Amino acid sequence: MNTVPFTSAPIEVTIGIDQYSFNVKENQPFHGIKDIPIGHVHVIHFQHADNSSMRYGYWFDCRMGNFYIQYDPKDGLYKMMEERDGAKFENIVHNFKERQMMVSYPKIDEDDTWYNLTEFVQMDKIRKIVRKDENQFSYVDSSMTTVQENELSDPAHSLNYTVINFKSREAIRPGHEMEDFLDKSYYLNTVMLQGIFKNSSNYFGELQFAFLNAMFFGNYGSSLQWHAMIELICSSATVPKHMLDKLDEILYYQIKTLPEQYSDILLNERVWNICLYSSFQKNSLHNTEKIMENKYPELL
Amino acid sequence: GAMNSSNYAELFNNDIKLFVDDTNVYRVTVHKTFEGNVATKAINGCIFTLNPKTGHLFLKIIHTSVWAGQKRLSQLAKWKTAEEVSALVRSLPKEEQPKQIIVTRKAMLDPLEVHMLDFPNIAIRPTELRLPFSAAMSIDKLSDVVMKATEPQMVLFNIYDDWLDRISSYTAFSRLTLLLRALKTNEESAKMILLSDPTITIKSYHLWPSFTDEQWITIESQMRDLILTEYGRKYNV
Ligand SMILES: OCCN1CCN(Cc2ccc(F)cc2)CC1
């Protein structure tokens, strides 16, 4: 079990860790989060009590170092940092535990929610999408644009998702215009899966990360990417049976975890009605369709 | 964006552009089979691609053989149209390729755009006008070459005959759409109107009769009256 200690909490803030969140008051004696489950990527994220504008946060893996949070009063945000002196770090963490100034990441005997949300998400891949290689954790926020968005402006602070474009030469083979555009199997299976991602797990990992960025930060371009990766599968007549089954599982938990009040901005009516009711794979997402119809029948 | 009554004069500027109309590409007769069920039988069609400034018409004849063994023919028709427009463009010398293509039905945007990915600087646009180009098969000589065709065939026409010698392309386009609107709403009356006076002939190299300036004005009035009329005969007004 791992720890992310905080030097302090000088400003009032809502802190979130994976799918859980609490409030910390301006200068309340708070020194971090404890009992964090090793073996999965995590997200600690922040919404300031004064400025709900700019949700931000840090993807990280406790196996890849000892990380702590410290408020920076020049830049005005909680910054994630790495302590290389591990002795100093164990020493500090032990003292805050003894003084009991750390909240406990909920140990929950029945819940696999987070594992199901992050099954294929891996820190090494995250850091290809969010390029900032001197750090081992990755910063994200509400406002960061994607690489495809900057094509339609600062490249350093961008989300370098895989570019998907249904009306592109990449997507459409000469001579198969009608075929490749109505049945995108070629683009999914050979261009993307064999070409760029190499396997279904890298594909799903990017889909999962995109959804979580959208959900946790309201990052519009991540939402666009999530929905695009869904649409390509759902618009391919030939998909490995095992990808379809895992996709149905992935999406099911995404839909289950979504905040009920946010469903109107984060769910694209067209893509979902297409995927669930028109596409080749309309009959293939049984768990996803059951939950969608019982929770958001309005959108359909 | 879209083409409508407000940006109407753009059609007559010096930027090359083409209208594409795909309404007559897939044509059928519906009939009863011996067993009493209904069957379609397809007949030759055509793609109507027109330069509204020059009057040049690239009439691509869609021979029925291209549907043999295909399914979902209404949808293929739109993809076949785009494939043929793209081939036409690629056949034209660069300085003759269009800078915009205007599709008269929105269902053609996606098929053409996909086929034209190699031409990112050619803008594919829709229009909000209700242009009567589907009545192009009411022009006898266009109907004649489509129905006679025995293979795929491109045939080239000037849909304005020699009008441009005496009027502008704006006026020329207005006459054509009035004529095509009239033929669409009541073909027999439209055709009667055009051919009453036997002394006015259609030249072998032309599609319409060789009216004088004065005779066109009378003609155009008769087509307006017709079009107002049939509108009454239809709505009771
Ligand atoms: O059903 C269990 C609900 N509990 C209570 C609400 N939560 C408070 C909390 C504590 C520590 C954190 F790291 C984040 C949130 C914990 C889950």
Side-chain angles (χ1 to χ4, degrees), chain B residues 81-117:
Chain B
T81 297
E83 177 182 32
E84 294 291 353
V85 170
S86 177
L88 174 59
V89 173
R90 295 165 205 281
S91 79
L92 297 162
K94 190 170 175 258
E95 82 266 336
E96 287 180 55
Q97 291 174 341
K99 287 132 224 177
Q100 313 157 25
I101 305 174
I102 304 148
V103 292
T104 67
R105 309 193 298 173
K106 324 189 186 57
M108 276 303 301
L109 292 163
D110 272 348
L112 199 54
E113 163 162 6
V114 166
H115 269 282
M116 303 281 295
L117 296 171

Side-chain angles (χ1 to χ4, degrees), chain B residues 215-231:
Chain B
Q215 294 173 323
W216 267 125
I217 292 298
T218 293
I219 291 294
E220 290 166 331
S221 166
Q222 284 162 15
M223 301 294 193
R224 293 185 180 101
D225 287 332
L226 181 168
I227 291 164
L228 146 81
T229 293
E230 278 297 316
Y231 172 108

Side-chain angles (χ1 to χ4, degrees), chain B residues 77-182:
Chain B
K78 301 167 197 310
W79 289 86
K80 180 67 177 179
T81 297
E83 177 182 32
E84 294 291 353
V85 170
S86 177
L88 174 59
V89 173
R90 295 165 205 281
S91 79
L92 297 162
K94 190 170 175 258
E95 82 266 336
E96 287 180 55
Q97 291 174 341
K99 287 132 224 177
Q100 313 157 25
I101 305 174
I102 304 148
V103 292
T104 67
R105 309 193 298 173
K106 324 189 186 57
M108 276 303 301
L109 292 163
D110 272 348
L112 199 54
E113 163 162 6
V114 166
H115 269 282
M116 303 281 295
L117 296 171
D118 300 333
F119 289 96
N121 298 343
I122 302 187
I124 311 301
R125 303 175 59 204
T127 182
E128 300 299 350
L129 308 173
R130 42 284 210 166
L131 299 155
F133 292 156
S134 77
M137 285 305 89
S138 294
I139 302 170
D140 286 314
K141 288 200 182 169
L142 302 185
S143 188
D144 275 339
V145 65
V146 181
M147 293 308 298
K148 294 194 208 293
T150 61
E151 32 195 301
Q153 189 178 346
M154 156 93 77
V155 177
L156 306 187
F157 294 89
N158 188 323
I159 205 160
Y160 300 151
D161 297 341
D162 64 348
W163 298 346
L164 286 176
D165 287 341
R166 312 191 46 80
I167 74 192
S168 61
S169 71
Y170 179 106
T171 299
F173 193 76
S174 311
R175 181 179 297 156
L176 172 72
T177 69
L178 167 70
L179 291 167
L180 294 177
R181 182 65 70 194

Side-chain angles (χ1 to χ4, degrees), chain A residues 6-151 154-254:
Chain A
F6 285 47
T7 296
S8 70
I11 67 154
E12 203 146 322
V13 56
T14 300
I15 305 176
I17 185 68
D18 316 346
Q19 71 275 36
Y20 301 102
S21 72
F22 59 108
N23 314 297
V24 168
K25 296 301 172 297
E26 167 193 315
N27 278 293
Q28 163 188 342
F30 170 91
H31 288 286
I33 314 178
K34 64 177 161 100
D35 324 343
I36 294 169
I38 312 154
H40 302 140
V41 294
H42 303 252
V43 57
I44 175 171
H45 36 117
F46 300 93
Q47 194 161 30
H48 291 185
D50 64 2
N51 182 244
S52 59
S53 304
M54 182 183 68
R55 282 173 270 178
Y56 62 99
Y58 302 90
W59 290 92
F60 67 94
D61 186 327
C62 282
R63 293 173 292 183
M64 296 173 64
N66 309 295
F67 308 113
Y68 66 103
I69 298 288
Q70 182 173 93
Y71 183 72
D72 168 15
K74 181 151 159 142
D75 296 13
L77 70 191
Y78 287 98
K79 298 208 162 143
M80 162 172 301
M81 291 178 287
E82 176 168 9
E83 175 62 71
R84 63 165 298 110
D85 186 350
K88 189 171 178 197
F89 186 91
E90 295 166 13
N91 182 242
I92 288 297
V93 163
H94 176 269
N95 176 87
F96 286 154
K97 242 174 233 196
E98 286 282 286
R99 308 237 280 162
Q100 289 197 49
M101 293 284 115
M102 312 195 163
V103 301
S104 187
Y105 177 119
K107 208 310 107 177
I108 195 327
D109 252 26
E110 186 209 12
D111 169 79
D112 268 323
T113 284
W114 190 243
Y115 171 86
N116 284 320
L117 288 166
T118 56
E119 185 161 0
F120 305 98
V121 187
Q122 309 276 351
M123 201 58 235
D124 65 283
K125 305 306 218 311
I126 286 188
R127 303 177 74 264
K128 296 175 190 303
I129 294 171
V130 196
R131 303 186 177 286
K132 191 172 205 247
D133 318 319
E134 53 282 27
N135 299 330
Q136 299 256 282
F137 46 90
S138 303
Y139 170 95
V140 182
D141 76 20
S142 307
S143 75
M144 280 168 49
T145 43
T146 68
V147 159
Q148 166 174 71
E149 279 191 303
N150 292 133
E151 299 168 352
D154 187 27
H157 219 65
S158 288
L159 291 164
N160 305 265
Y161 291 119
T162 310
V163 184
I164 309 184
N165 183 359
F166 296 140
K167 295 193 291 195
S168 82
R169 172 52 64 212
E170 285 69 48
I172 298 297
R173 285 170 305 179
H176 296 258
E177 283 82 7
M178 173 177 187
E179 181 194 21
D180 278 353
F181 181 84
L182 295 177
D183 165 17
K184 324 198 167 272
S185 296
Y186 156 73
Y187 194 35
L188 168 70
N189 286 309
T190 297
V191 171
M192 286 282 163
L193 282 178
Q194 296 175 11
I196 309 197
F197 289 99
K198 305 309 170 194
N199 58 60
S200 41
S201 300
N202 289 336
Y203 192 94
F204 289 137
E206 180 167 327
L207 200 155
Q208 288 191 317
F209 182 58
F211 168 81
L212 299 173
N213 282 328
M215 176 174 71
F216 284 125
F217 307 105
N219 183 276
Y220 181 70
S222 304
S223 184
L224 280 167
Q225 179 67 15
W226 180 49
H227 270 99
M229 295 188 79
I230 292 178
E231 191 166 351
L232 175 54
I233 295 182
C234 287
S235 289
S236 290
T238 303
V239 185
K241 310 93 180 60
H242 78 265
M243 275 188 50
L244 292 171
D245 281 333
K246 180 66 67 176
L247 180 60
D248 191 34
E249 284 305 312
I250 289 176
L251 293 177
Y252 168 86
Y253 281 96
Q254 286 177 347

